[PDB]
Structure formats: C-alpha cells, structure tokens
Design an enzyme around this catalytic site. Structure first.
Site, PDB file in Angstrom:
ATOM      1  N   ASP A 172      14.808  28.557  86.061  1.00  0.00           N
ATOM      2  CA  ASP A 172      16.269  29.015  86.010  1.00  0.00           C
ATOM      3  C   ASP A 172      17.228  27.577  86.199  1.00  0.00           C
ATOM      4  O   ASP A 172      18.330  27.618  85.645  1.00  0.00           O
ATOM      5  CB  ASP A 172      16.498  29.851  87.281  1.00  0.00           C
ATOM      6  CG  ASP A 172      16.768  31.237  87.324  1.00  0.00           C
ATOM      7  OD1 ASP A 172      16.213  31.737  86.196  1.00  0.00           O
ATOM      8  OD2 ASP A 172      17.554  31.870  87.983  1.00  0.00           O
ATOM      9  N   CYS A 193      19.423  32.108  73.280  1.00  0.00           N
ATOM     10  CA  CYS A 193      19.293  32.089  74.824  1.00  0.00           C
ATOM     11  C   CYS A 193      20.447  32.921  75.218  1.00  0.00           C
ATOM     12  O   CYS A 193      20.731  33.888  74.601  1.00  0.00           O
ATOM     13  CB  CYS A 193      19.085  30.705  75.148  1.00  0.00           C
ATOM     14  SG  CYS A 193      20.090  29.462  74.608  1.00  0.00           S
ATOM     15  N   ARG A 234      18.584  25.978  75.449  1.00  0.00           N
ATOM     16  CA  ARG A 234      17.176  26.291  74.862  1.00  0.00           C
ATOM     17  C   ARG A 234      16.916  26.413  73.469  1.00  0.00           C
ATOM     18  O   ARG A 234      16.331  25.906  72.859  1.00  0.00           O
ATOM     19  CB  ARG A 234      16.619  27.526  75.985  1.00  0.00           C
ATOM     20  CG  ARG A 234      16.913  27.372  77.216  1.00  0.00           C
ATOM     21  CD  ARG A 234      16.706  28.480  78.249  1.00  0.00           C
ATOM     22  NE  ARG A 234      16.746  28.515  79.535  1.00  0.00           N
ATOM     23  CZ  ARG A 234      16.894  29.493  80.262  1.00  0.00           C
ATOM     24  NH1 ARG A 234      16.755  30.851  79.861  1.00  0.00           N
ATOM     25  NH2 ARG A 234      17.246  29.346  81.728  1.00  0.00           N
ATOM     26  N   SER A 235      18.017  27.162  72.688  1.00  0.00           N
ATOM     27  CA  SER A 235      17.934  27.389  71.528  1.00  0.00           C
ATOM     28  C   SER A 235      17.777  26.061  70.693  1.00  0.00           C
ATOM     29  O   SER A 235      17.082  26.138  69.780  1.00  0.00           O
ATOM     30  CB  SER A 235      19.101  28.237  71.024  1.00  0.00           C
ATOM     31  OG  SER A 235      19.079  29.477  71.733  1.00  0.00           O
ATOM     32  N   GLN A 270      22.359  21.155  75.944  1.00  0.00           N
ATOM     33  CA  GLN A 270      23.465  21.318  76.748  1.00  0.00           C
ATOM     34  C   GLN A 270      23.708  20.387  77.761  1.00  0.00           C
ATOM     35  O   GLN A 270      24.531  20.250  78.543  1.00  0.00           O
ATOM     36  CB  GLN A 270      23.529  22.686  77.280  1.00  0.00           C
ATOM     37  CG  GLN A 270      24.013  23.860  76.370  1.00  0.00           C
ATOM     38  CD  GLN A 270      24.198  25.111  77.127  1.00  0.00           C
ATOM     39  OE1 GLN A 270      25.416  25.249  77.431  1.00  0.00           O
ATOM     40  NE2 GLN A 270      23.153  25.906  77.293  1.00  0.00           N
TER      41      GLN A 270
END
Length: 283
Positions: free
Chosen positions: A180, A214, A220-221, A261
C-alpha cells in the site's frame, strides 16, 4: 554498470534529487482533449491526463476520449498502452479500446480497493456464470478461468463484440501484492510477474499493445514498462551497459506524463532492472 550508478546514488543519498531532475527535464505537451468539459468525468485524476499527440482514440464519433496513452518504444520494438483504472462510467470504453487496439493482455497493478478507497472499478466478471455486458459499447465479457497465486492472479477472459459476434481471448494479469505504501524490498516477485506476462505472448508484436494500468496509470504502470523496456534493450544491444534508465524513462515520458511517481519507485526500477539483468545476462 547501472549498478555502479545505483550504489553511488545510494551512498550520497540523492534519490529525491535524481528524481526531481527527471521531473524538471520531462516533456510537456498539450492535453487539450482530456481537459474539455465534456470529458471531466472520464478522468480519474485532474493532474493525470494523456497528451493529445499520443492519446488512444476510441473509434466512435460521439466522444473518442479515453484517458490512455500509446507508449511506442522505437529501439526496443515494444509498444504499451498506459491507462487509468476504469471508472464506473468508463468500463465500456476500456474494453472498447482493448478490442479496437487488438490487445491480447491487460496488466493490472493495483487492487480494486487500496488504503480503504476505491482505486478502480470492478471492470471484469468475478464469476464464470455472471458475465458482464457493456451496453454503451456493445461488448460482452465472460470469465473463463482464474489461476490465483501468491503474488498475482491470471485470468482468461472472453471478450465478444456483440455487433459482429467475433470473440477474442484476453489474458488478465493481476499483480495483487504491491504494498500500500512505498515499494518492496526485493524486486524478485515483481520480476517474476513481468516474466509471466512476457511468457504469455501478451507483449509480442503479433498482437496489439498490452494495456497496462494501476489507479492513475503512471506510477506502478510506469515501473512495469520502464523495467520491461530496459531489460529488452540490454538483451538487444552490443553494449548492454549502454542502457541508461534515466534516458529511457525520459523517452517514455514523451508519451505520457508523470511515469514513476516517487523517488522510491525510481530506486525500485533500478533495483528491478539490475536484478533482472542477471537472468537476461545468461543466468
């Protein structure tokens, strides 16, 4: 060796500074279609939009907009579609894109609920006997099978164009164990997952581009496609050490904003490529 740069950046604890430099140098192109009023509810995040020049256009004259970008990697000979997690009202658009772009695989890097909030609509059927029909785009989607593993789940889906009754098998690769907060200590399981996607044929040039998402379609992508492309380039070049991850990321950011990110995700991308390069090297 990229690994030397890695350990250097680690010793001098300068990851935020390296990451910031990427933010500064990254391309900026217009996203005017994304920002039209009639599209406000097609975007999950106000600060995450596809550039006009690389956006995927739905094949409809009503509104061709979806928050999705074609990332076309010249030298690697690999293309990806990065998109946001579908919204309650964009699940039909999502599967329309998958159909029109001839994708064989969908890579999902988030859970439907994370940190107590919905990150993504439930856009595929969870039970064989309850298929989904997306009436706005005239598609039918059926769960054919599901293989649940520790770190990920692979589903076989059947997508039918109800207009023509053509059917295709779509492979759904669902990475279910991204933490998370932050990133994992070892890129081992992420890499394992990437190789499973690769082995499926989903990434192969006989098919349309894999669809990767994502929640926003950049973090994550971005990690997934950055690691894949870096490893592909190391395999193809005469001088693998010539692969500059920062230069690959900036090239990718020509096609969709904001990929990777956080500095954590940057560092993890390094980790994944370095560790992965070891299989790619001959072992």
């Amino acid at each position: 060796e990229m690994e030397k740069e890695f350990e250097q950046i680690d010793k001098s604890g300068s990851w935020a500074a390296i990451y910031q430099d990427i933010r500064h140098e990254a391309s900026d192109f217009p996203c005017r279609v994304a920002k039209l009023p009639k599209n406000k509810n097609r975007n999950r995040y106000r600060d995450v939009s596809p550039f006009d020049h690389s956006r995927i256009k739905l094949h409809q004259e009503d509104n061709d907009y979806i928050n999705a970008s074609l990332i076309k990697m010249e030298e690697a000979q690999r293309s990806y579609i990065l998109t946001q997690g579908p919204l309650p009202n964009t699940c039909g658009h999502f599967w329309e894109m998958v159909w029109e772009q001839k994708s064989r695989g969908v890579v999902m890097l988030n859970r439907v609920m994370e940190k107590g909030s919905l990150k993504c609509a439930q856009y595929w059927p969870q039970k064989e006997e309850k298929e989904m029909i997306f009436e706005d785009t005239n598609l039918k989607l059926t769960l054919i099978s599901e293989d649940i593993k520790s770190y990920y789940t692979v589903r076989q889906l059947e997508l039918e164009n109800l207009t023509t009754q053509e059917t295709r098998e779509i492979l759904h690769f669902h990475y279910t164990t991204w933490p998370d907060f932050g990133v994992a200590e070892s890129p081992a399981s992420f890499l394992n997952f990437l190789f499973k996607v690769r082995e499926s044929g989903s990434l192969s040039p006989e098919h349309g581009p894999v669809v990767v998402h994502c929640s926003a379609g950049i973090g994550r992508s971005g990690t997934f496609c950055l690691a894949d492309t870096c490893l592909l380039l190391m395999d193809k070049r005469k001088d693998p050490s010539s692969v500059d991850i920062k230069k690959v990321l900036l090239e990718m950011r020509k096609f969709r904003m904001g990929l990777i990110q956080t500095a954590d995700q940057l560092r993890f991308s390094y980790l994944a490529v370095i560790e992965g390069a070891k299989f790619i090297m001959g072992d």
